[PDB]
Design a protein around this ligand. Structure first.
Ligand SMILES: C[C@@]1(c2ccccc2)OC(C(=O)O)=CC1=O
Lengths: 233, 337, 216, 294, 56
């Protein structure tokens, strides 16, 4: 099946040049645009870099521009992240999200297993306004996310994505473009809202919904996530 | 046996007598008081410029944005008609394709032709590539038309004078329709997907009940091979396009000819026909290199789509009636509005 | 004014267009031959050395050929013969020994007349192949040509009969100016049929190139 | 007498009545015929020749160069009606000289490119060069135009008008002892393309005849057409080069001191040069109008 | 054998037993459908470019 395995972690002294590698298997890697998304030990997700299909388009986060280099080599289906001048702010677990872009596609549908990296000693602001809410099985909860700019485009589709990060698991796509439901996601999850105001409705929630929910915008680069809303009990 | 021939002849005579008795007034006499739609001005809003050979088929998705086209360069191309973007490009094993279909769910596309095989392609896979879901190889003649009933049922028309209903899950012919004496060239499904009509080279059109193999009615009146067929949006009528430069309208309930869409300066055969959303316009591709828009009620020509430099082989109308896509033997598709 | 997803979709469309252009460039360098004939002629024998449409690929002198043997198609030729418009040449196989009876030679004449004088093959050259020359000589040693050719005044020799049959097949061409007919008596001695096909295809390609330049 | 030193090189500039006698006419006739033919050819190209293949692209560029030479002819005509009193200020001069030189070079280069394209289409029919895309043809055309402009800009950056006698002067092909890039360019544009065209035509004829292809009437028409193109090129570009070599020989032997010996050759040189414009005038007639299609 | 004649006779007798309506009634139904749905036909009535997806 679709698989994304990453390697190249471990202790790195500041100023190192450790390289991350991501091995893809089970899908047409040569056609998928690949992202690198890191996550600090107890903070939310943070988009790092992105390389398109055919390597024609490459984007970087301002925090890592000039220091990090992304590269894909299609023959053996491997994606690389050349990290240089690593500092204490780069201690995070890095993911190898894949994204296909065409009409009706679902970007960020599959996430890698995550590789840990420890370093020894105008952008749209997306706000969730909440950290954790109490929920019981069989109940319905509404997770709200807010954006500074209007995610609604002249095309007619608002570029809002919803991800669920279960404890000890990689983030999983649930809703892309604020309305559509990702493949393999039960119909209980629902996305809705308007410009600068969105809401996620997990009607009749049960187990396996426990985790942190992140709202992401794809209107323009750099991609920005929310602070994360956690569910307990 | 002479008795069987006499019985068939007298049955045909009684059918003709019943048709004449049911004929009290032509559509033209009843619709004369209806105001004409006037000149229909249509302009090429988009031009799809990806193919490299003659385009033989095109179909619209259930949404009025995505469309698929087939050409003799062995490529199945799915277009984003709003932005002229190429969503997919499916390479075919056999480049001799004369038909193309889009599933109503949008998950599959079908293709076929001189290989006598109808191939189903999966457009939505976890691998991110289009793959051949199933190949249907029960026909002994070239595949001329194929239409999806649902994700699991497809009806195909072949050059072996037979039409077959398939089951993509098993890949076997669930039903076979055998009433034609000539190659079947066109196929059209009813809006309720409970009946379908076919146009064969024997200058006849037959109404098939898809539920069980049966020819409910036979429609005749054309003077040459029927190349195109299309159902009226209401579902109680259909239009045919033959090689005698005439288009005709038949009604299922009346079981008779209604109107003939012919003009003296037109002598070339019709390659494709289709209606508008309301059924007031009957577009028809021709070998005059241009499409002619016909007033379906008054039988008067309303406009001409003269943007093509070669024979217009395929023609389709969106579900909402927002646009018209015309494919031709030059490797260009044109979206009119 | 395109969003990031729209820009990526446009990039994907551009990549698809590039792949289509490469595929078309690769395909335009191949020679497409339509193989026709009767059900008992030496079509297979022609195809020996190298459900519906049968496609054969072979390479000769760095040139890629594609023979489309549409023989298992009992449908109407009118409704699909236009699909083959634009082929480099048409390879027609005729059995010289089919003049005995069961008139087969007359069916070959009818098929050749239909194919040659067709509104689609107005300027496509026809490579005529006359197979079974040895068995033709063996038959003409004993039996008379006059069975198939009532209006034939000539000796019963292989040379004269072969030349007369070649002429009777050639004069059926009405478009003697826009289309050229190449005739070769097929022999299984060596790989001479492929050489003849290559020579005729080179002739056709030279004429097509001169047409493109506007000098032919 | 004379020794005007046009720029600094004591050139022997002349002024004869035969100039206004013979030139201004023939130039007017060439202007009318070339303008009509090139306008018609360009019109057919942009509105009735939408196929636009590589050979069509090179032919269109040839027609464009001939059309530019036609539109730049009238300034040279005006000047001829006089014994070379250039009464169009200066920029028109330098512009006319540069544009005429670049037009001659472009027409010659694109005609040679057409000959090479025919050679590759006949002698090597199975070649990727015979199937180059329209984009590649446009790139090659732009590159050739770039080379032409690069070799012709040397005339533009110059205050050409001098004051020979009591009147101006606009001629660049003066009899100057110090040879420059312009004369070598004038010699090369004939000699090297002549060799290329002759070789290509000979190979085309020999290949089209050895293969027994000289049976179709169209093939014989093409053979005669290939011969006629080379004949036209040589008969239109040889007289000027012959006189150029003659005056160079006189320069080498006469010592460039006296000028009266150069009078007849300088007079005849411009009469022969009036055939270079005739070449572009009848180029469309033989290339696009005489073509078997339309 | 004569099975094709039997099949043809059966098909003709089968097609004989069908209910038939007047042609004028069918024409009236078609006219009624056309006039009822003419408002929702973008091709028949040219819609303004504001809500035309193919405006450009
Ligand atoms: C007589 C002359 C000319 C040209 C343009 C403007 C003025 C004069 O023709 C050429 C030429 O075609 O290159 C150089 C010239 O001396």
């Amino acid at each position: 099946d679709v698989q994304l395995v990453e390697s190249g972690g471990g202790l790195v002294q500041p100023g190192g040049s450790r390289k991350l590698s991501c091995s893809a298997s089970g899908f047409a890697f040569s056609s998928f645009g690949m992202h690198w998304v890191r996550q600090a030990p107890e903070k939310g997700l943070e988009w790092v870099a992105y390389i398109s299909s055919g390597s024609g388009t490459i984007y970087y986060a301002d925090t890592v521009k000039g220091r990090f280099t992304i590269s894909r080599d299609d023959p053996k289906n491997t994606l690389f992240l050349q990290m240089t001048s690593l500092r204490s702010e780069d201690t995070a677990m890095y993911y190898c999200v894949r994204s296909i872009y065409y009409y009706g596609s679902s970007p960020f549908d599959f996430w890698g297993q995550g590789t840990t990296l420890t370093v020894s000693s105008s952008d749209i602001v997306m706000t969730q306004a909440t950290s954790s809410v109490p929920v019981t099985p069989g109940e319905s909860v509404s997770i709200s996310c807010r954006s500074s700019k209007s995610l609604l485009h002249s095309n007619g589709n608002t570029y809002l994505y919803w991800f669920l990060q279960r404890p000890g698991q990689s983030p999983q796509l649930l809703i892309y473009r604020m309305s559509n439901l990702a493949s393999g996601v039960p119909d209980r999850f629902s996305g809705s809202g308007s410009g600068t105001a969105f809401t996620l409705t997990i009607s009749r929630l049960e187990a396996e919904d426990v985790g942190v929910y992140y709202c992401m915008q794809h209107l323009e680069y750099p991609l920005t996530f929310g602070a994360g809303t956690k569910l307990e009990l | 046996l002479d008795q069987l021939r006499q019985e068939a002849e007298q049955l045909k005579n009684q059918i003709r007598d019943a048709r004449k008795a049911c004929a009290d007034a032509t559509l033209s006499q009843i619709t004369n008081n209806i105001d004409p739609v006037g000149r229909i001005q249509m302009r090429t809003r988009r031009t799809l410029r990806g193919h490299l050979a003659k385009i033989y088929a095109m179909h619209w998705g259930t949404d009025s944005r995505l469309l698929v086209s087939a050409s003799q360069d062995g490529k199945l191309i799915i277009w984003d008609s709003y932005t002229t973007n190429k969503v997919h490009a499916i390479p075919l094993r056999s480049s001799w394709v004369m038909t193309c279909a889009y599933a109503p769910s949008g998950n599959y596309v079908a293709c076929g032709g001189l290989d006598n095989i109808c191939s189903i392609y999966n457009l939505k896979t976890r691998e991110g590539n289009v793959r051949v879901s199933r190949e249907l190889a029960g026909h002994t003649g070239y595949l001329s038309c194929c239409r999806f009933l649902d994700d699991n049922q497809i009806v195909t028309s072949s050059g072996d004078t037979t039409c077959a209903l398939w089951d993509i899950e098993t890949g076997q012919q669930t039903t076979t329709f055998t009433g034609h004496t000539g190659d079947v060239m066109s196929l059209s499904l009813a809006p309720d997907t409970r009946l379908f009509v076919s146009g064969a080279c024997d200058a006849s059109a037959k109404l098939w009940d898809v539920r069980e193999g049966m020819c409910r009615q036979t429609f005749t009146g054309h003077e040459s091979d029927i190349n195109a067929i299309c159902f009226f949006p209401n579902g109680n009528a259909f239009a045919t396009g033959s090689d005698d430069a005439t288009c005709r309208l038949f009604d299922l309930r009346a079981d008779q000819e209604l109107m003939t869409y012919s003009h003296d300066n037109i002598i070339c055969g019709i390659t494709s026909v289709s209606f508008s959303k309301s059924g007031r316009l009957l577009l028809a591709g021709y070998d005059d290199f241009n499409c002619n828009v016909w007033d379906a009620l008054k039988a008067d020509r309303a406009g001409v789509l003269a943007g093509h430099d070669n024979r217009v082989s395929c023609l389709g109308v969106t579900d909402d009636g927002m646009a018209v896509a015309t494919g031709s033997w030059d490797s260009f598709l044109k979206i009119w509005n | 004014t395109l969003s990031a997803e729209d820009k990526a979709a446009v990039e994907r469309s551009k990549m698809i267009d590039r792949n289509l252009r490469e595929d078309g460039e690769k395909a335009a360098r191949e020679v497409k031959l339509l193989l026709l004939g009767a059900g008992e002629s030496g079509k297979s024998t022609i195809v020996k050395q190298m459900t519906g449409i049968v496609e054969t690929h072979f390479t000769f002198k760095d040139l890629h050929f594609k023979m489309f043997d549409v023989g298992a198609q009992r449908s109407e030729r009118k409704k699909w013969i236009h699909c083959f418009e634009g082929v480099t040449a048409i390879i027609f196989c005729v059995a010289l020994s089919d003049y005995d009876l069961v008139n087969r030679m007359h069916e070959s004449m009818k098929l050749f007349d239909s194919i040659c004088n067709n509104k689609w093959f107005t300027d496509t050259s026809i490579i005529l192949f006359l197979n079974k020359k040895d068995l033709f000589e063996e038959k003409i040693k004993k039996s008379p040509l006059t069975i198939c050719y009532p209006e034939y005044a000539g000796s019963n020799t292989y040379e004269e009969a072969a030349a007369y049959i070649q002429c009777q097949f050639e004069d059926l061409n009405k478009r003697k100016d826009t289309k050229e007919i190449y005739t070769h008596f097929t022999c299984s001695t060596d790989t001479k049929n492929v050489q003849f096909v290559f020579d005729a295809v080179t002739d056709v390609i030279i004429k097509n190139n001169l047409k493109d330049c506007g000098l032919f | 007498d004379h020794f005007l030193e046009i720029d600094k090189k004591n050139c022997c500039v002349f002024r004869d009545d035969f100039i206004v006698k013979v030139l201004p006419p023939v130039l007017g006739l060439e202007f009318i015929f070339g303008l009509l033919g090139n306008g018609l050819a360009l019109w057919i190209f942009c509105f009735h020749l939408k196929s636009w293949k590589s050979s069509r692209i090179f032919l269109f560029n040839l027609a464009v160069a001939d059309f530019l030479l036609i539109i730049c002819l009238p300034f040279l005509m005006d000047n001829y009606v006089r014994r070379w009193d250039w009464k169009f200020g200066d920029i028109p001069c330098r512009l006319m000289l540069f544009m005429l030189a670049m037009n001659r070079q472009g027409s010659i280069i694109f005609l040679t490119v057409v000959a090479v394209d025919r050679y590759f289409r006949v002698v090597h029919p199975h070649h990727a060069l015979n199937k180059i895309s329209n984009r590649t043809a446009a790139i090659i055309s732009c590159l050739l135009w770039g080379i032409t402009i690069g070799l012709t800009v040397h005339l533009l950056k110059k205050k050409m008008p001098i004051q020979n006698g009591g009147a101006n002067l606009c001629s660049s092909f003066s009899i100057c002892h110090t040879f420059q890039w312009h004369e070598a360019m004038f010699l090369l544009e004939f000699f090297l393309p002549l060799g290329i065209i002759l070789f290509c035509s000979a190979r085309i004829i020999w290949s089209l005849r050895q293969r027994q292809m000289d049976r179709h009437a169209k093939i014989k028409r093409a053979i005669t057409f290939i011969m006629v193109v080379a004949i036209v090129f040589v008969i239109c570009f040889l007289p000027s080069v012959v006189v150029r070599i003659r005056i160079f020989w006189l320069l080498h032997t006469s010592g460039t001191q006296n000028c009266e010996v150069y009078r007849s050759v300088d007079l005849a040189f411009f009469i022969t040069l009036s055939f270079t414009y005739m070449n572009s005038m009848l180029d469309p007639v033989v290339y696009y109008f005489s073509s078997p299609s339309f | 054998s004569i099975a094709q004649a039997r099949k043809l006779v059966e098909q003709l007798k089968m097609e004989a037993n069908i209910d038939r309506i007047k042609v004028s009634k069918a024409a009236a139904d078609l006219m009624a459908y056309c006039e009822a749905h003419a408002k929702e036909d973008p091709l028949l009535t040219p819609v303004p470019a504001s809500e035309n997806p193919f405006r450009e």
